[PDB]
Design a protein around this ligand. Structure first.
Ligand SMILES: O=C1N=c2cc([N+](=O)[O-])c([N+](=O)[O-])cc2=NC1=O
Lengths: 731, 399, 395
């Protein structure tokens, strides 16, 4: 019943809200947390808003309207992740009471009998937007960088401060879930006003509070009976799209969970289904009962394991990387003038597009002008699709394509201070291609290589300045894949790391730093994923089950489909190089059981999508379906393991392989392993990464590293020694 | 388990079609009262005080079908106020469940004479009108992988290998045998024509029938769950299946119709005291189930259980009556138990005449009572699949 | 042939209508919570031997539509072969489910059956399902449809029950319900409701007003021309004395109840200990306008059917729909006052339509065992003029 966290009995949190009442009786609450640069929904805020809301009630006779504003660059962003990530199952009561107290304050503000206007000066994300949604009118400043939304589903949470309950009562169940809640979409101020999230816009922040007080003065004069009354608090309120008992919405309502299950492909992500349950259940009862249900589902997510995985990766791990965690400490800046891409394939053309989209002049060289020209057409094809979708102007798109200069002459790399080679996976080819350009480019130019497997130290011997040679690994398609794997050669200087680090941030991608070792991190770990699936196929498991297993595990692409695009001939020479290194050192090579399946498909002339046929069939450039001869070739169906066994084998192979990379020194931090596996090779976000998967594993037999080892030993006894955990995981 | 339960009367209304149907103007309460008044016409001297309960199956008990429609029939038809009245809902088997529950009440000895049957006016109260604890609860719907019956039937045809021509061949077979049964006079005394408050005829035949159905006409129909996502959900459980072959259309699936059926069940002493002649005996009943996503494989374990409970095998049964909800379900049932074709739905089924959810079980039960007498045969086994993957089966024996 | 035994009888607490604790709880969850409690009582129970689940529900629409019994089977992870059927016989649905389960067990064609009922009246108010007896003018004009409260006021007028008489019965129901709670009688059978996090939602019967006084009951006010309709049939009555209020009538609440029933062999096979035996069941009826007079011939019928009399019965449990109904029943059969609704009734604890019959049934199973008594007779009046009665014997 109270607006405060405690009601009994040293140390109290600071005040974060400034109070000001004008002569008209308009109170301006200015949130300004002194402990940071951004207002956050922490214990200091809850106490500060509690006093303010108590004061609004005590002085209601002398108060005519309220304005909620901020003194930071942003409006209000997020909650206390450090506290919510520590919530144990036994802490469910505390979590429940906290969000109930938070919403009790916003509900009093909402039913004050007076108009409350939010002056949104900057970003209002998560808890910030929830405060604004509790106001009766929302004005945002159309400023650069301003974002509005409820992105807590991306951390495994849900909008627990009224975000679910209010958006559903503003837009209906379907629109609120699809457009705002299910994916936590961020919106620019113009988009926010368009969908109903924001009511009015202003050009500058200085107009906000005056325009807010203006709207108060006009709302009081024009609509005195409905001032400070939300639409759902009026007698004739009718939910958009109907309530679950309305015949129209009831006809399509049972299909909402199945459509969500279609989207998620059966992956174990509990937050979206918790949002759907809270939304629908809330729409069946009054606002207050709906709000309390919202608290129970929220507490269910916060104390769960998936939210801790997601909070660990997408908040803590990402922030450490973005703060230069893998970047060398004392290195300055070196701006880039002209980028030179070698090769106009899918990789080289995608690299030139994301470089031009960032504002860089790119020279796109290939062996023929016809080839380089068709490479720039990749950028024109993406810009033409962004023009139709209306995401960029014709004036801005023309300047983007004008920074791409397709050529076939090596002399056109004159004045280039950043080289990104993306030619065929062959050492002496890259040696030759770099030799033809190392003297034409600037003497301080970075010599980057987009290599998947060949070690950078060996590639560096083909140039003169090996200190400026480095591995800059992108992922197809470059215009969408957000990771850049930076590979440190033995001769690579620390300054070269920082320049590629800064370049990665300039083009809007996330970097990880990896020490030189064949397979690096991404390619080596993703190999164990497709190898486990090809093993199952050779063991007689149904292909349809293998693909279903990969999708229900949470992967963006099933493993047989991914194998057809990695090309099986490339997988072959990867094992040949591995077999050569062992047998040249005098050892005995233990081949992976998948190698027999690769060489089998090579012999049958089905080496992948690039050569027209693989595990799938391809017609007119599109994938048709599983090759019917696949079942007869491998006796599909003779082995029928549990689906979870198939799922765990793929996840554990990568998790175990990540632990080796950490042990061998390939990776330097768990943050790089988690983000690198999520953004690079598509490790399921619900795991929080392939390293987090170990410390946060949850199965029927328990949770944590101990339960991971027990399950790994369970898999090893039934499928092979490769599932045995390393000594680093044992006690 | 002492008293033997006997069927004394089993009648039904004709089934009116969904679109521009003759029964659309007829309240479902009237369809039942009409059958009650027919029973009075056939036995004017029966002491209705000896009727202890009226049990009606109804899958959508809302609106015209809410408020315990069985009790409404007792009061509206002027039956004794001590005759009770209870509605039950066990999805498609509600009609047969009502009969089975009536028979089990007689066997316990604590009931003497019971009316049982069902009513479903699907043109007035569409399937789903009652909402549903599974549909209105995404937390439930997400966990238990809800899949509509039409997709389970397509999945059955895919696994078992029933082609589009196979299911359409059965659909043609159902239309033919239904027309032969009507033309042969088989339904003359059990299908009670519906009349208005003035005695004017409203419907006297199963107007959903398409007796001039051809193989080519069936092949021209389009497959039928139009929102999507359920196929992906289904294949998430049946992960070894790659593609669902949608083969079911409106011509090889049960018809949406209006109708009702009444069955009179009592002990030997009850019928003897009221001067009634027993037509058949309830030998055994059973209830089982199967996979909830495939949903429609429930009739098989319920049939094996009722056979084992009665100490019989498939050979001992003369007639098999299975609800024609979907052609593939019947072909799966026939394939599993090696049912001879000449013994399976010998007078047609729901594909031809319709499937009034809550009443279907009592309709096909009475259809077998009449066909056993017409053929002078001994045993018949009646079964229906159920939503949520349940099964109900009943064995009757001619007396 | 077979004898039917009760092995478990549990119920949720009853949450009130206004600002009730159970209003945020879907009725499906109420049932699933009780299923999970039975599993806790017998974790080694082979659920495959459960052949049906029978639930009473008077308003099977919305959250209660679509065969909520089958939903409980699927949502709780019970075997798909465990069945699931919803039935509606108005107020007796909960007891009708128990009787039907017993009769199925007696027929030998069911081995182990779960029975009970569920009614979330704060989410699905009564009348939400519609109905021909109310919404069809042709048949409404013939059956003389009258709300049950007026039938109760009519009973008090004929039998001569004053306003003080019905309030005096309402007082002892509050006193006896409070004494049963404080005495620990309900400590085992009332299963507290919790949310998905384990947090408590409700652990007691909110509708109870244990500080009720006779002076407070007098301050209450009594509740379409239905008076003229009733007096048209009962023509010898000049005026109906409206003595029933919200304090001497049943409370509108949310709740659910479950009862596990099976044969002696079925229980012995599963290591269960029988608690009581179902001796006999009966169904009868009475006037559909006065409505609530069905229990008297139904109780007489179940006594003759079991070869018993009132003197053979230790406890009488009649649902407290209205005070005059219970006083009419007590007067007709001359029930001793210390044998009637000994642990309080719906006036204090509430009447969750579809679940009530199973709740008061389990209430007598516990009280027979606690008193070490032999027989109890349970009965409920029903809308439309019906009556259901059951006799149980402690084992
Ligand atoms: O056709 C027959 N039908 C029978 C039916 C019954 N019946 O139970 O109704 C019995 N019998 O009573 O044993 C014997 C029968 N013997 C027959 O040969």
């Amino acid at each position: 019943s109270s607006h405060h966290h405690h009601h009994h009995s040293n140390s109290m949190p600071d005040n974060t809200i400034q109070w000001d009442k004008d002569a008209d009786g308009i109170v301006t609450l200015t949130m300004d947390d002194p402990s940071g640069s951004t207002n956050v929904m922490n214990e200091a805020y809850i106490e500060s808003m509690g006093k303010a809301v108590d004061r609004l009630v005590a002085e209601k006779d002398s108060i005519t309207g309220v304005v909620v504003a901020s003194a930071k660059k942003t409006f209000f962003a997020g909650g206390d992740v450090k506290t919510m990530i520590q919530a144990r199952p036994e802490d469910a009561g505390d979590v429940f009471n906290t969000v109930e107290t938070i919403k009790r304050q916003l509900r009093t503000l909402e039913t004050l009998g007076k108009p409350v206007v939010a002056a949104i000066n900057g970003a209002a994300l998560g808890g910030g937007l929830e405060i604004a949604l509790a106001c009766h009118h929302r004005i945002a400043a159309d400023v650069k960088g301003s974002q509005l939304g409820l992105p807590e589903v991306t951390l495994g949470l849900l909008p627990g401060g009224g975000g679910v309950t209010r958006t559903v009562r503003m837009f209906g169940i379907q629109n609120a879930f699809v457009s705002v809640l299910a994916q936590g979409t961020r919106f620019k101020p113009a988009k926010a006003k368009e969908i109903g999230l924001v009511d009015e816009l202003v050009a500058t922040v200085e107009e906000l509070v005056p325009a807010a007080k203006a709207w108060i003065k006009e709302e009081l004069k024009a609509n005195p009976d409905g001032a400070g009354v939300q639409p759902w608090d009026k007698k004739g309120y009718k939910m958009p799209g109907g309530t679950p008992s309305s015949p129209g919405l009831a006809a399509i309502l049972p299909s909402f969970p199945s459509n969500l299950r279609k989207q998620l492909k059966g992956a174990p992500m509990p937050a979206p289904r918790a949002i759907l349950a809270a939304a629908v259940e809330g729409a069946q009862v009054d606002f207050d009962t709906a709000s309390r249900i919202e608290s129970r589902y929220f507490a269910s997510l916060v104390t769960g394991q998936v939210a801790k995985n997601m909070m660990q990766a997408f908040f803590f791990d990402l922030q450490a990387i973005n703060a230069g965690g893998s970047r060398p400490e004392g290195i300055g800046k070196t701006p880039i003038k002209r980028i030179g891409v070698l090769g106009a394939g899918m990789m080289g053309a995608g690299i030139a597009y994301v470089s031009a989209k960032a504002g860089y002049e790119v020279v796109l060289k290939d062996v023929s002008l016809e080839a380089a020209a068709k490479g720039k057409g990749y950028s024109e094809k993406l810009e033409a699709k962004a023009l139709e979708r209306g995401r960029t102007t014709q004036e801005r798109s023309d300047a983007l394509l004008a920074r791409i200069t397709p050529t076939a002459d090596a002399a056109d790399f004159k004045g280039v201070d950043f080289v990104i080679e993306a030619v065929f996976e062959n050492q002496e080819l890259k040696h030759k291609v770099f030799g033809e350009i190392e003297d034409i480019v600037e003497p301080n130019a970075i010599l980057g290589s987009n290599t998947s497997t060949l070690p950078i130290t060996g590639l560096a011997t083909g140039v003169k300045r090996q200190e400026d040679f480095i591995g800059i690994h992108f992922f197809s398609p470059v215009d969408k894949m957000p990771l850049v794997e930076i590979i440190k050669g033995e001769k690579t200087s620390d300054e070269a790391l920082a320049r590629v680090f800064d370049y990665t941030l300039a083009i809007g991608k996330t970097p990880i730093v990896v020490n030189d070792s064949r397979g690096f991190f991404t390619s080596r770990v993703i190999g164990t994923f497709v190898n486990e699936a090809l093993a199952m196929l050779g063991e007689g498991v149904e292909p349809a089950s293998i693909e279903q297993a990969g999708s229900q595990a949470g992967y963006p692409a099933p493993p047989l489909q991914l194998s057809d695009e990695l090309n099986l001939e490339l997988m072959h020479k990867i094992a040949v190089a591995t077999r050569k290194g062992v047998e040249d050192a005098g050892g005995t090579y233990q081949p992976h059981p998948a190698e027999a399946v690769v060489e089998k498909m090579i012999e049958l002339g089905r080496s992948g999508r690039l050569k027209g046929a693989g595990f799938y069939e391809y017609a007119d450039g599109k994938r048709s379906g599983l090759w019917p001869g696949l079942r007869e070739t491998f006796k599909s169906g003779s082995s029928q393991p549990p689906l979870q066994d198939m799922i765990d084998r793929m996840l554990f192979a990568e998790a175990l392989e990540t632990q080796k990379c950490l042990d061998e020194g390939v990776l330097t931090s768990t943050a790089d392993a988690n983000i690198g596996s999520i953004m690079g090779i598509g490790f399921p976000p619900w795991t929080g990464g392939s390293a987090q998967f170990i410390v946060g594993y949850s199965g029927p037999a328990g949770t944590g590293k101990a339960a991971f080892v027990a399950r790994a030993r369970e898999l090893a006894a039934a499928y092979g020694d490769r599932f045995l955990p390393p000594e680093s995981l044992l006690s | 388990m002492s008293e033997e339960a006997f069927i004394y009367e089993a009648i039904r209304t004709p089934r009116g079609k969904q679109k521009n149907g003759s029964l659309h103007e007829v309240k479902p309460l009237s369809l039942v009262v009409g059958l009650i008044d027919e029973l009075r016409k056939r036995h004017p001297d029966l002491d209705e005080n000896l009727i202890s309960d009226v049990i009606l199956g109804c899958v959508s008990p809302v609106g015209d079908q809410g408020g315990d429609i069985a009790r409404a029939a007792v009061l509206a038809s002027g039956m004794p106020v001590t005759s009770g009245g209870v509605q039950l809902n066990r999805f498609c088997a509600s009609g047969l469940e009502a009969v089975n529950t009536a028979a089990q009440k007689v066997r316990s000895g604590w009931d003497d004479l019971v009316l049982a049957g069902g009513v479903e006016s699907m043109s007035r109260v569409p399937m789903g009108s009652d909402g549903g604890a599974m549909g209105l609860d995404p937390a439930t719907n997400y966990d238990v992988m809800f899949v509509p019956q039409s997709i389970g039937a397509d999945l059955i045809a895919t696994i078992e290998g029933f082609s589009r021509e196979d299911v359409d061949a059965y659909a043609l077979r159902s239309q033919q045998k239904a027309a032969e049964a009507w033309s042969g006079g088989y339904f003359a005394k059990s299908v009670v024509p519906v009349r208005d408050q003035n005695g004017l005829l409203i419907l006297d035949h199963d107007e959903h029938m398409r007796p001039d159905t051809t193989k080519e006409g069936l092949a021209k129909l389009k497959p039928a769950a139009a929102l999507g996502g359920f196929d992906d959900v289904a294949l998430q459980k049946y992960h070894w299946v790659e593609k669902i072959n949608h083969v079911h259309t409106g011509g090889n699936s049960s018809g949406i119709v209006d109708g009702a059926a009444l069955v009179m069940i009592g002990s030997a002493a009850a019928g003897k005291l009221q001067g009634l002649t027993p037509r058949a005996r309830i030998v055994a009943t059973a209830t089982s189930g199967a996979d909830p996503v495939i949903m429609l494989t429930g009739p098989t374990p319920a049939t094996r259980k009722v056979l084992d409970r009665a100490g019989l095998t498939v050979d001992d049964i003369d007639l098999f009556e299975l609800n024609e909800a979907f052609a593939s379900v019947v072909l799966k049932f026939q394939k599993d138990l090696n049912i001879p074709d000449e013994k399976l739905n010998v007078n047609g089924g729901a594909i031809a005449m319709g499937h009034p959810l809550g009443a279907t079980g009592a309709m096909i039960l009475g259809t077998m009572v009449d066909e056993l007498e017409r053929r002078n045969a001994r045993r018949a086994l009646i079964t229906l699949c159920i939503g949520g993957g349940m099964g109900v089966a009943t064995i009757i024996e001619r007396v």
